[PDB]
Amino acid sequence: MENFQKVEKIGEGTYGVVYKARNKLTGEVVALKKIRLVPSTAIREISLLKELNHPNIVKLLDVIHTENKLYLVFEFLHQDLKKFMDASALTGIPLPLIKSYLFQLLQGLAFCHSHRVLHRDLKPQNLLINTEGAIKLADFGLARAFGVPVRTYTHEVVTLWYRAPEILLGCKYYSTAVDIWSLGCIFAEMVTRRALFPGDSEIDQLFRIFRTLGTPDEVVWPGVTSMPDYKPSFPKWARQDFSKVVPPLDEDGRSLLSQMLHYDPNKRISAKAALAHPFFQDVTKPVPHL
Numbered sequence: 001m002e003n004f005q006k007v008e009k010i011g012e013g014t015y016g017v018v019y020k021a022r023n024k025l026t027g028e029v030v031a032l033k034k035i036r037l038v039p040s041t042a043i044r045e046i047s048l049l050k051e052l053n054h055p056n057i058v059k060l061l062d063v064i065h066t067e068n069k070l071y072l073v074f075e076f077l078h079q080d081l082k083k084f085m086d087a088s089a090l091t092g093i094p095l096p097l098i099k100s101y102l103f104q105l106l107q108g109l110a111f112c113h114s115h116r117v118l119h120r121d122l123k124p125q126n127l128l129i130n131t132e133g134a135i136k137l138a139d140f141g142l143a144r145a146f147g148v149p150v151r152t153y154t155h156e157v158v159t160l161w162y163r164a165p166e167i168l169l170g171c172k173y174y175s176t177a178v179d180i181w182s183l184g185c186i187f188a189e190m191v192t193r194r195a196l197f198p199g200d201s202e203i204d205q206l207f208r209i210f211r212t213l214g215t216p217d218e219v220v221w222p223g224v225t226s227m228p229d230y231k232p233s234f235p236k237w238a239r240q241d242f243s244k245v246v247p248p249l250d251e252d253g254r255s256l257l258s259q260m261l262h263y264d265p266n267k268r269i270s271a272k273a274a275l276a277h278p279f280f281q282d283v284t285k286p287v288p289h290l
């Protein structure tokens, strides 16, 4: 990484620092991830990402491995969904844009998911935007690759806000639907301008889900009561109408979000099926101002 000149700290990820950086030889502008430990499977895992190429997936440019330290070099985008959400909070993000972004992330998930790759940690901060109206997923596949801790190397708390219930209930094996749950929460959040489930511990996170969606049981979620962290003592909350959860959203939109938020990971709509949902009948791609 003597072939890069650091330009600035873009932020602390799970895995370490991400820098905006400039290739001193090639002139190219990049994001550089330092990864904190390296280990064999991780290198093989990274190296499959190199080939997982999609317009809605931030490109993995190169993997550099020297002096036992690890660096990931990605295409660079100029803004993330959060700063855009902040920027645009007085009036909210126009619904046509919300729809465009949802549709492109869905296209993204459909791609990775059909190759078996999960994100496992989607959030406004890894959703990245550009001036041409594109939105792209960042850090695909890095969770299986490295692991996830509680505190980042900088003991910033990793957020729970987008985590799927089956994860919090301790299922050791999850599928792609965990990303659908996350994207669902991010959708609601775009629509309303406030995180759907801002939990600040695992039980607070689980109990906020429960309060909005009803405490899961064997009727809505076969098999639920016998998952590791399920306690028959959970307070027994009633399910709220979605007209109340995401008010301004129209029917096709409340209908999609619903199926992305199904309790049973098995019944949860896949990316592929979401893409075909009536909500996208009128989908376009506007340019965000920026």
Ligand SMILES: NS(=O)(=O)c1ccc(Nc2nc(OCC3CCCCC3)c3nc[nH]c3n2)cc1
Pocket (backbone or CB within 6 Å): 010, 011, 012, 013, 014, 018, 031, 058, 074, 075, 076, 077, 078, 079, 080, 083, 084, 125, 126, 128, 138, 139
């Ligand atoms: N706050 S912000 O709007 O000022 C802004 C944000 C991100 C970027 N650019 C950018 N950022 C990344 O990681 C940001 C990421 C670090 C790890 C966890 C989530 C946050 C990238 N990873 C690949 N490519 C990347 N490109 C430009 C401006």
